[PDB]
Amino acid sequence: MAQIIFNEEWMVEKALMVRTGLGARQIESYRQGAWIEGVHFKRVSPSGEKTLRGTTWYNYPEINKFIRDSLEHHHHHH
């Protein structure tokens, strides 16, 4: 254990597509599948209480880990 460092690569929707190289349509399609709340992203509101205006921040390491599957082309479906 050298030092407890955290992956603070949290970024909003429009920022994420720029950092990863994806588009809004491809990300929303992923949110209908691979993007899981609590796992690959979380809900950050401009307050301490429960609001539906809570901005969603996505995890870059989690997403690059997912995309890695397509780069690591492997015949997964028979």
**Token couple for 72:** 């690591």
Distance CA 29, CA 11 (A): 18
Sign of the C-alpha dihedral computed for residues 28, 33, 39 and 40 taken in this order = negative
Burial class of residue 8 in the structure, from the number of CB atoms within 10 Å of its CB (0-12 exposed, 13-18 middle, 19+ buried): exposed
| Residue 7, CA distances (Å) to 10, 23, 33, 41 in order | 8, 23, 23, 12
Q: Which residues contact 34 (CB under 8 A, 6 or more apart)?
A: 40, 66
Cβ proximity of 59 and 13 under 8 Å: no
**DSSP 8-class letter at 46:** S
Q: Which experimental technique did the depositors report for determining this structure?
A: NMR
DSSP 9-26: -EE-HHHHHHHH---HHH
Q: Tell me the CATH number at 63.
A: 1.10.1660.60
Domain range enclosing 77: 1-78
Q: Which residues pair with 11 in a beta bridge?
A: 58
Number of domains in the chain: 1
3-state DSSP assignment of residue 6: coil
